[PDB]
Amino acid sequence: TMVISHGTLSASAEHAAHLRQLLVHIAQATRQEDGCLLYLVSEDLSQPGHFLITEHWDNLGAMHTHLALPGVTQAIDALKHLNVTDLKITAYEAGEAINIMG
């Protein structure tokens, strides 16, 4: 069963540029991983400096493998240094795709 992850986090004006760079780097690496079907990092049009992490994993096991990687630990550590303290990620098992448009 495919799994969808939704994450949000924000940075102060002072650290936003650094966070964007970090997020783009994390996305480039993660997309290469086993079971990673989608990994997008984006910025809220309604709130500058507020970001979203959107992920689709083939299964829970693949996601767990990702979460345990040293690169993930390193990324979390980097956030501490950017005083990014509000990262929250929640995942959900997904049913079959419902094609709404396109």
Add this chain to the structure above:
Amino acid sequence: MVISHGTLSASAEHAAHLRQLLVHIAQATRQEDGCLLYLVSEDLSQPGHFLITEHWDNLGAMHTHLALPGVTQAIDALKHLNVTDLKITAYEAGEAINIMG
């Protein structure tokens, strides 16, 4: 709940109008019955590419939204901003799995 994941993009000529449209639709949609979340965002890895992230309490509430005249109008608006790549996929979501934070 039902999660919707939508993607679309625009040329630089039209992107400012697309951003304003997206913000407008999000502000409106958040007030609708059963709308738990409605975020519009821009891909950091790909300027001009947008994501529409929606969480609906139930499938019927999402259907009601999709049927609104305002939605039909927004879709027509996209056409005239030369957006040709709109894709929306929804999924019924299971129970929350806390990952971190």
